[PDB]
């Protein structure tokens, strides 16, 4: 393989393009990189464990990995209190050590192994233009992805459960026993609108629906894996797509961009798969928490919170949603679709119930609302909490804010990468990625426009 | 020979005066829809209760606005992120009161500009060009999506979208500084470097080419007649331009390669606008600019102010005055 411009036509700043047709070095690149991902997982987990104060809420402490492990049900109890520090440490150590194994294997294949795998084995050696082998690799990796989704199902059903924030008695690690196998609910989540009140798949509000979706995903991915091992692409697919390594890269780039946007919105809105005991309140959660906190405070002073008009004529504490539901007032009218385990006990069939607001508010709901309104996902880049006009004394930016911003930006730049690699794949397959040929310039043969 | 193949050949035809293409089949209807509704709403739409507090803001020309103050006002805060098409309103007058034209125009416009980007790729493919003009156009698209879609999603209301007007744009900018300190956000700082530098490099490049034009005319006629469209020869002396600019600063600060120089011209403002679009898109989730309020304290602990503290006083003024009847509670949390 050429490791310079004169022998490849690619500069140093585009060097990894020198690997496109070197499958062994490409595999080593791919495997060393996986090393890196598992390395960050393990080392970041060990960092977060070392900096963790377990009696303090995770979201106060700049943690984005321990909430993921805690949502799986490890090292936590009721209300997300940390029982034991050892499962988080175990997850870190196992990733870190394995990452050493993956890094050694990538270096081998990259530096010492055969540069092309096609002269060594037909099973592992691939040509990008060989549609059967490409779909075989899709198929192997789909069976593995389905096995991973079924492993999440097995953790929730058979090996200790997941954290359910919606659990009666308070949020707790519970074992899922009746997952939603009903395909109407599971795929009607896919059919729901990506707008307010509907939320597409971001609105999944119970662990039974989540675990049932992963049974179906596991089944769908395993079936699609066998499909693609046993079959070859059909004529419409062969005539519709570009068949090259850069093309398949760009297809994956568009896919990754879509999932990055979905992940940013998921962590910004959903409090079920991202429980607020670990990630802190959502922005909608915190705004409704402030409205509830001052409803409770002024009700304790003797305000008639239902008959109180504000300055505009709308109700100061309670008002009507556009479909009529009894909701909190002020600007949080926007957030009347919010649902949370601290709030839903005060909701009736028509919305917020006057009787429950008068004589069913518990002290823990007040405590949770005060904590969530003061841990709103508002913060500066140097991690100064609250509104931006506040002074420097509160060191806090929400993990929801960090995760959402990161993945939105990642998703955008991966769309840019999709456009770049798709466009280049199209031009390279069509033969003009290196520029216009002067003799056969296509515009010089076209008629004039006017 | 089939009717469908004839339609495919017409749609993808390089002989069309305006290229349609398959992306154009989406772009033309959407952009025409958003343009028609925007013009009609800008001239004649009734006032819109943008803040959801029954205080309707007049945006159209016929209701007392001028060109500067006129806007298509964003949809109601009561709507939030809810989908509000015409058919979900009980009447057209209710749809107009609640800011439905904003949702119609924005949604069609955003589809239209994404299909404009795809159409730029498509024509580059049909002309045998390299395909990355659409990558450059992705930077204004990212900024438009940031202010019309992503910031409303993060803040939970289209009411927080940039209004479709001049003074509404200024209102959006000022309230954004009050709530996010975008001036102290390093990505806006890259945006500003992007546009300032892009204008600098536009002027330098244009000035260097115009400075080094080959003599092909008299001083009676315009120098632009020294260029013939489709001529094979270069119309300016790149070596003279390089010999000027590498003495203006020093030799290796100057591009001797026209391709390298044109890449730099393309890349610098595109990267800067990408960064500031991500700044607005991340301030959507309230990851705000730098807070250095009371960062400096004297040995006793008394605050020593900086220019950031004076800027913060300006931000307070905006904040405590904006949407002045909307807030019922001590914190502006969204």
């Amino acid at each position: 393989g050429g490791r310079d411009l004169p022998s490849t036509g690619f500069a140093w700043w585009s060097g990894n393009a020198r690997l496109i047709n070197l499958s062994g070095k490409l595999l080593g690149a791919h495997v060393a990189h996986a090393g890196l991902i598992v390395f960050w997982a393990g080392a970041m987990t060990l960092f977060e464990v070392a900096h963790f104060i377990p009696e303090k809420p995770m979201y106060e402490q700049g943690l984005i990995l321990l909430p993921h492990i805690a949502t799986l049900g490890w090292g936590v109890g009721p209300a997300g209190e940390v029982t034991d520090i050892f499962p988080f440490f175990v997850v870190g150590v196992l990733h870190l050590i394995s990452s050493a194994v993956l890094g050694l294997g990538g270096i081998y294949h990259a530096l010492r192994g055969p540069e092309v795998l096609e002269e060594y084995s037909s099973f592992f050696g691939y040509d990008w233009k060989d549609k059967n082998q490409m779909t075989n690799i899709i198929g192997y990796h789909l069976i593995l992805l389905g096995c991973g989704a079924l492993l999440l199902v097995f953790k929730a059903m058979f090996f200790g459960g997941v954290y359910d924030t919606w659990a009666p008695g308070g949020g707790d690690v519970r074992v899922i026993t009746n997952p939603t196998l009903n395909p109407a609910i599971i795929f009607g989540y896919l059919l729901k609108a990506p707008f307010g009140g509907e939320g597409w798949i971001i609105s999944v509000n119970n662990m039974e629906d989540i675990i049932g979706g992963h049974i179906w995903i596991g089944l769908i991915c395993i079936s699609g894996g066998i499909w693609h091992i046993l079959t070859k692409p059909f004529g419409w697919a062969r005539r519709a797509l570009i068949w090259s390594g850069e093309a398949y890269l760009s297809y994956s780039l568009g896919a990754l961009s879509l999932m990055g946007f979905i992940a940013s919105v998921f962590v910004w809105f959903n409090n079920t798969a991202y429980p607020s005991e670990f990630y802190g309140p959502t922005g909608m959660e915190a705004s409704q928490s402030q409205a509830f906190t001052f409803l409770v405070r002024d009700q304790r002073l003797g305000a008639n919170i239902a008959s109180a008009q504000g300055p505009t004529g709308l109700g100061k504490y309670l008002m009507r949603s556009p479909s009529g539901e009894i909701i909190f007032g002020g600007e949080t009218m926007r957030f009347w679709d919010f649902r949370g385990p601290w709030l839903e006990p005060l909701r009736g069939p028509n919305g917020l119930d006057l009787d429950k607001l008068r004589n069913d508010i518990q002290p823990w709901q007040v405590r949770r609302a005060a904590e969530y309104m003061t841990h709103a996902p508002l913060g500066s880049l140097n991690s100064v909490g609250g509104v931006i006009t506040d002074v420097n004394s509160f060191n806090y930016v929400s993990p929801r804010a960090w995760l959402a911003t990161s993945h939105f930006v990642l998703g955008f730049f991966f769309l840019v990468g999709h456009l770049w690699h798709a466009g280049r794949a199209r031009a390279a397959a069509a033969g003009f990625e290196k520029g216009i040929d002067r003799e056969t310039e296509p515009t010089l043969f076209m008629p004039d426009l006017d | 020979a089939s009717l469908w193949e004839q339609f495919c050949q017409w749609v993808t035809s390089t002989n069309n005066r305006i290229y349609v293409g398959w992306f154009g089949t989406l772009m033309i209807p959407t952009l025409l829809t958003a343009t028609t509704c925007f013009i009609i709403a800008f001239i004649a739409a009734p006032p819109v209760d943008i803040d959801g507090i029954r205080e309707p803001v007049a945006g159209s020309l016929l209701y007392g606005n001028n060109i500067i103050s006129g806007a298509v006002v964003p949809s109601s805060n009561a709507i939030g992120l809810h989908f509000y098409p015409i058919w979900e309103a009980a009447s057209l007058d209710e749809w107009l009161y609640n800011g439905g034209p904003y949702q119609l125009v924005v949604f069609h416009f955003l589809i239209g500009i994404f299909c404009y980007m795809g159409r730029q790729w498509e024509l580059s493919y049909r002309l045998g060009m390299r395909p990355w003009i659409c990558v450059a156009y992705s930077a204004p698209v990212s900024a438009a999506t940031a202010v019309f879609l992503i910031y409303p999603i993060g803040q939970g209301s289209f009411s927080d979208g940039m209004p479709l007007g001049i003074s509404g744009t200024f209102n959006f900018m000022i309230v954004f500084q009050a709530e996010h300190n975008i001036l102290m956000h390093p990505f806006h700082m890259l945006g500003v470097a992007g546009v300032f530098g892009g204008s600098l490099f536009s002027a330098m490049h244009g000035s260097l080419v115009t400075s080094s034009l080959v003599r092909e005319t008299t001083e009676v006629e315009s120098q632009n007649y020294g260029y013939k469209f489709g001529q094979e020869e270069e119309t300016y002396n790149i070596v003279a331009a390089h010999g000027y600019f590498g003495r203006l600063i020093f030799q290796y600060a100057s591009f001797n390669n026209s391709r390298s120089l044109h890449f730099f011209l393309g890349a610098w403002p595109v990267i800067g606008i990408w960064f500031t679009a991500m700044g607005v898109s991340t301030m959507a989730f309230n990851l705000n600019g730098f807070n250095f309020n009371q960062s400096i304290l004297d040995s006793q602990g008394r605050v020593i102010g900086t220019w950031a503290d004076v800027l913060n006083r300006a931000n307070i003024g905006f904040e405590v005055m904006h949407e002045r009847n909307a807030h019922n509670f001590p914190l502006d949390l969204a």
Binding site: D448 | I43, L61, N66, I67, K228, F229
Partner: peptide, 30 residues
Amino acid sequence: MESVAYILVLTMALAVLFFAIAFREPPRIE
């Protein structure tokens, strides 16, 4: 009646756009 003047200047700009596209000086290689 200031609305009439605003509509007129905006209409003049849009009409100039139409005539500048549909009846442009056609580029010719000579």
